[PDB]
Amino acid sequence: KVKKIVLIGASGFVGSALLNEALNRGFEVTAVVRHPEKIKIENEHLKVKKADVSSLDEVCEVCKGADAVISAFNPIYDETIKVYLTIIDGVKKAGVNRFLMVGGAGSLFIAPGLRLMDSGEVPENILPGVKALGEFYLNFLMKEKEIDWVFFSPAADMRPGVRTGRYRLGKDDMIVDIVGNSHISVEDYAAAMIDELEHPKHHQERFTIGYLEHHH
Template sequence: MSNIILIGASGFVGSAILNEALSRGHQVTAIVRHPEKVTTTHSNLKVIAADIQNAAALTDIIKGADAVISSYNPGWGNPNIYNDTLTGYKSIIDAVKQANVTRLLVVGGAGSLYVKPGVTVMDTGVLPEAIMPGVKGLAEVYYNQLKPLTNLDWAFFSPAGNIAPGERTGNYRLGKDDLIVNDKGESNISVEDYAVAMINELETPQHHNERFTIGY
């Protein structure tokens, strides 16, 4: 059993990770903006309201944890999502280091994955313009905040191009920097299987200071 800090546990991906972690017997401290949005109850779950942008307060909460999993998203409807993503992750990274927690797993985005050499999903024009600020923010977190880090064991886990509610099959493929597609050119994963792979990575680390991705 691990003592996990889960940031953004009330969100779409975060709630799936929360359920998967609890089902495997882990102790989870969920950090959220609105505790009332966490509808799961469990003897191994503690829910704390906190401002992610406050690194000092965050440091105090996460001290003693075995790992931090971050599904932080300032909200797709937030007009400041780009800047808030960057400042939020700077705060999270600073807090993790200050708390002497050595493992950080980040729910990444698919936008920075490659579809062919030198061309990312963001470059193809298939993503709606409305979500591009958030997509670009997460990409910059990966490139500019995580990749230069040498004193923290991090992993940035990008989902498939389409992540949606579905089945927990446990059958999927993992890759590194390239979008995983099926024989029809589709890139899909259920949020349940994404959560399985994230907790697998927590329990049996395979990726260190790198990005990895998932798909069917």
């Protein structure tokens, strides 16, 4: 079973949510962040380390021995795509067989043959980053066979909320509620990610999540 893991980019709303969810469930975690000072969690199953995510040798070194690696790394952008690659290649060179990545909603279908990125529904101010993340999955992950990867596409609108434990799990189509909105809490997204880590249901593929009920 999976016991020891490395969490790359264990900061921000998502990285922090994954960090706490994994420790609370008995995992021994090595969190890699740019600013260790921001983390004040006290637990004997936790190690905090700094690494140059853009350096292949540094990513490879910190992942050695791990049972699995989860990356929550974010975020011109041809440099970004380049970093997404260095991470997965660093993980493969370390010998780990399971890699889980926090994805985006851009590559999800909102209609037959139409992905969210190409629809115009994405806010102008974040389109560049959305496209780069979607392109990495589509043009790189989809051809990878030398590791068991999982790209987890969150709902179009993800923010801090409640850990309800109730939601729909999908594959490639965006999940929307009765009102037509696609959303999920950061806490519920993390709970699902650790569920996939603890009890594998997906292999070399992308899956997604979203609420079915609507808040009032």
